[model samples]
Target chain A: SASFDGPKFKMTDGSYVQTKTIDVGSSTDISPYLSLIREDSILNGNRAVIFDVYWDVGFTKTSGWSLSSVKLSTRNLCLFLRLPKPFHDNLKDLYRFFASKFVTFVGVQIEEDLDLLRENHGLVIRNAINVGKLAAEARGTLVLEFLGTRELAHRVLWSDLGQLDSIEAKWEKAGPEEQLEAAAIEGWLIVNVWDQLSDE
Target chain B: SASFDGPKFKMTDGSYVQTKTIDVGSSTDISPYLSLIREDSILNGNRAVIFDVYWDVGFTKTSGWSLSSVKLSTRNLCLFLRLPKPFHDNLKDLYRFFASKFVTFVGVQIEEDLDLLRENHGLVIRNAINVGKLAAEARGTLVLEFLGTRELAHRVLWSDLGQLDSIEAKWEKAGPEEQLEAAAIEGWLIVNVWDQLSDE
Candidate 1:
């Protein structure tokens, strides 16, 4: 605990965990994180995977995240926009994890992310729960609309995104740990929020 | 050099060297980067220091960077925009580094940055060279205007800030090394540019 970097995160169970952002980019395999998830695996009702896809502003348009068609029309732009080599190199297994009915996918606005993934990567996700809808469901008629990832986390999880939210502006001067925190923290928060709010 | 991360950078001398972005936000002893210099030290024609201050977008008004009055008006907004804790903790030494008449500070639009630093932090800096003006001077009457850091680096250095430029949109997904790279690379480039374009 003394060796940990970044802020201490207050969890739902009233325990403080020293949080570290894990990066999966350099590594070829993600199975270490989501162990042995297969396309035709035995269903595990106990398992849930918090799924996320981040979007860039300006890259998005009135039509929504313009990620789908970005590759073909502009070569150099795609060169810049391409995810780490592992995303393509490990594409099949990556999507295979998503395909598994054994694993339940959880997130806010899961449809938009899934739709974008469908158009762009041909990923088919069905065993998924929209945490936004789940939260609204818990609230009962008052929140018929979907809640954003931050808003939901703030209501359910006391951590409330905190300084990590502002990492967007200070990113240029950020240390590598800070970068990892920005990239990975939202997904971390959403998973916790889902854990607190969802009915098992 | 073999122990380094990041891509090999090509310098004007036609040599490829491993490059790393050094972040000064962590440790307080900046003297390691720039050795002891006092306000009264005898002027040395042999030494120069590269200085930089970054700005955030939405926070900046049309009038310009808007960094001058930021700390006073909006407290929470300023929190997001603040530099690392070291900036305030080592404020005296940090500004004293800028105060040295013995050191020639080099950057693009040195006035705008110095002016903001002056207004905000009460930093008094005069011995600074604007690389944009130096580039125009080197061009010898074909140009009278200033060139941006990128355009100047592209024409002169050919190291041409490359993937580091788009690191903006890809920032949230960045690794820590990439964040350090994004934060420190531009200053690194401008230094190289000044080195190449200047007479002394």
Candidate 2:
């Protein structure tokens, strides 16, 4: 709670636990390795994981989230987390625990603009998928769709990057009003990609 | 089918009908008026409408779509068109008919590269809503939302251009890869806003 450099967890015994964070910026960014998963392990039903990253509209900061499970399906990376026993029973307490840790990991501040644990929490998640789909298509897949929070399935691939180039051209050529509209949408998509988890 | 100009409709009696199109470029663009919807009438919920525009990404030419309903609601402007019997029974045919007409209206070639109207159609719609939400937030709630297949509801609003400027600044400061990803998402969003109608 005092420093924003790493995870800080408060135990039921009123003791605080802290862990070092992986910097999402810097050349030493070990964020990818932080995921407790591998490609081969992901293919089997025995263990699966969901990877989530949080940040403000600008990438000045970020926080990482990973949930590993024994019964999770690889085909669907976006599944509900089933924390055992006391953690599930005290989700509010758990959410705060993760929220604090995440802020320290990415060193960004996240606020509960809306609780991501609620029913309509999918609104923010859906926007994140939109951002992902946008990235996939601009790279050359003229058409693509988000299959889930993490997976984007493409149908028609193009070679010349017509769709991508044209979008840039359109953005440049658009009226200030249209540009505003486009920019605002982009910001909204990025900010909401990861659920807001902290006040710091 | 042969020329991409204005809209051409084929009657059940096998005759062809054509309508002039509105140009969305230059000072003469009459797109707003093309709606045939009066503000007072829209407020009363008796004659609300869906206004569709056709334009190449370059905006060299344009066409407008209007589906006016006397029973349409102003509060919830998105509504499904309950078409007459024959058209209702053959939605595939109707979709193609509109698709062909739309291409000529905007003078841009659209390809059904991935059959946008089929499964996963909701993805594009969600992005459209994101774009709508961006506009809404930027202008402090001037407009919003999209309903499946038929309508987009936008309440009237205006500009100081603050939101747009902030978004542009944010993008400028973002990482190169992050910008690419953002640009990709924007392109994907626009291309799929409307369902592609022709293989041509």
Candidate 3:
């Protein structure tokens, strides 16, 4: 029910894109936007909620993609998923539901906020994939192609770094200093990951 | 008289150096401090002026170098020169005047200030030696060793890079866009200069 406004993205062609955020609770059923996707679409999951995306219609390749005659168009509805716990397993469910259908590139965004609980808790999930990918890469373990800042993204592959689950669980049960140390270790490991990737 | 008060510089050993700037107009004659130099010293010129340097006696090296028991020592005086126009030529006079005496290091400081006339005028003077040195380096010409930042110092030797004068002059007469372009080009060239020095 909240409105967020900002020109948060810049395209390669030197133009800006504006977007808005709409908040929804469990009781709020967005049947109108839901009708845009196929019944078979995996976006029907409980984690997925509708968010309105606004941008210029001229940015599209053809007029057929344009939803309105105005310079600014707001017909696009995007999924802003909170992502369920045990995301390594949940991601597979995501692939099974969405992959090989109409969706092509699955975009993931990670935002950092100043809250104590949310920041460290968010890091556990982020580090889970990051550490998972490193072990997978080293042991010739199955890897996914998730890309874009810190969070590991792969083209719908299961990259479960085994001990990461236990580590995250322990972190949840530990003190503040231990959580802080985990965040530091995660930073160092990610730098090593980028160094390795750049070399190859 | 104006007080320029601050901890302006820090020593490697973690103590701060304080400084002040006193403006003396053309009518001021600094004969007392000038008497410290040899009778034949080039510092006898009209450009020379008395500038007081103060420091804590405890900050110095052992024995022979330590001048006082007091907390603040004001016995130091530096040659503050306006650096006459055609500085490439003026530098030679500087060496002839100050090179042979008890001076350990001939320190040179360049300060840039902003005014309508000064901003770009200062650039021309700055780019003169810098661009001249760069071009000379390319031509395998003789180069002077003006090292480090803030102050330029080298053992007395002829370091001449010719014809930087014209480039700077042309930039002065050019439009604002051209001047800005020159500044940008100068920045990139300086980076290359540092990179080459670092590699060596």
Candidate 4:
């Protein structure tokens, strides 16, 4: 029952996409966002949510993927929640929200992303689906190869999600807000495509 | 006539190194920094200044290195001046400051850095010295191997600049201010080591 003033990003191709992005630090801060997800998820008989986590190895030059943020995009809203700090203050609420059995987090490369979260931050994601694997499995094809975001978006939604660089901006350091924008777009595409695929 | 409170960083080894860093954008914004360099450098009959540029390919997922900022560290102060936007409004001043014949820019792998600046940014640096080559030349050895920052610091200043990962925090994104701290450390090491080498 909230009216969202969507944040519009003029894409590299000069088109605008409006998305509702809520960025928060701690689990206490994320309660309201989580409440909205709870209502929109299967707990209320709506569609399960789309979840994606972002980390850059280049950041902090860690041994491997350093899980920084977890993003969840539903039908109408998106949440960009930071890790480490948030993980420090509120453990139970954040862990449950991520690893909940009732909410299905969906994204391409969801397994690897979740694995990093578990290994690095001791954050586990229990219920999740790899949208790329699901797409390939539905078409009776082996999900042997990893499908890039652009390719998966093209196949599932028949939409060009711009170039590969712009799509996988999870690692972006420079440019005008490219990293956050790409995160939003990637999260939206995962949920949007899942809705179409899950409809049947 | 400026006294600097050198920013102190606690290294991964739990040791502290104090370095003065001034972060800025635009050439006009850089006047004071450049003036400080002009005084401490050979332009005023002092030692040459250590100049290094910081950029990361992963930052923007660019085709190559997206040159973001140029850093120059002398006896007391370091200037971290950002590119592109700064290059936008102040062309002649920025270019002349970088390419000046009176002030010699010195660092390890300096040529490659300047090359990227030229290729990606159309910013050319004319008077520069590679400390690695200078060190090898001083010792009557081939300047064949590209000495890493840790190695260079160890050899020149007889100082352990920590592990390679900690030394090259150039691409660090996630850790607590690792990238900027590394830039400051890297700039300090280059100038400090250069002062010793240039003594004879």
Q: What share of the reference contacts survives in each candidate? A: 0.00, 0.00, 0.00, 0.00
RMSD of each candidate relative to the true structure: 22.3, 23.0, 25.8, 19.3
DockQ for every model comes to: 0.01, 0.02, 0.00, 0.02
What digit string (tens of lDDT, one per residue) describes model 4 on residues B1-200?
44345567654445454454444445445554565565555332243567777785743333367766677776555566665542444434555465443345677776667657655665555445667876775555564237876567766776666643553654544343466577666666776666565444
CA error at residue A126 for candidate 2, angstroms: 16
User: Looking at model 3 chain B, which ten-residue stretch has the lowest summed lDDT?
Assistant: B64-73
Error of 3 at B198 (Å): 19
Instruction: Give the per-residue lDDT digits (tens) of candidate 1, residues A46-157.
Output: 3555545543211111122233111100100000112452245554655666677766677555554566567545667768777766775675422212234444565566
For all the models shown, what interface RMSD does each have? 24.2, 19.1, 30.5, 22.3
**Alpha carbon lDDT of each predicted model:** 0.45, 0.24, 0.26, 0.57
Candidate 4 segments exceeding 4 Å error: A1-28, A42-45, A56-65, A84-86, A143-145, A163-178, B1-200
Clashing pairs in 1: A176-B176
Over A1-200, each residue of candidate 3 has an lDDT whose tens digit, in order, gives 42224223332233333333223333333332222322212222111111111122243133212211101111122223233222232232222222111111111222221121122221111111123343344435454333432234122223333333345567768664343333323322333343333223
Q: Over the stretch B1-200, how does candidate 3's per-residue lDDT look in tens digits?
A: 32224224332233333332223333333333233332312343212211111111111011111111101111122223232222343234333432333322111111111111133222222121232233224434222121211101111222221122122334324564343332222222232333343234
Q: lDDT at A24 for candidate 3?
A: 36
Best by lDDT: 4
Flag the better candidate by DockQ, 3 or 4. Answer: 4
TM, chain A, every candidate: 0.61, 0.22, 0.24, 0.73
Q: Per-residue alpha-carbon lDDT of model 2 for A41-126, expressed as tens digits?
A: 23432222222322111100111111211111121121112333222332343233333322221101111211222321121221
**How well does each candidate superpose onto the true structure, as a TM-score?**
0.36, 0.22, 0.18, 0.42
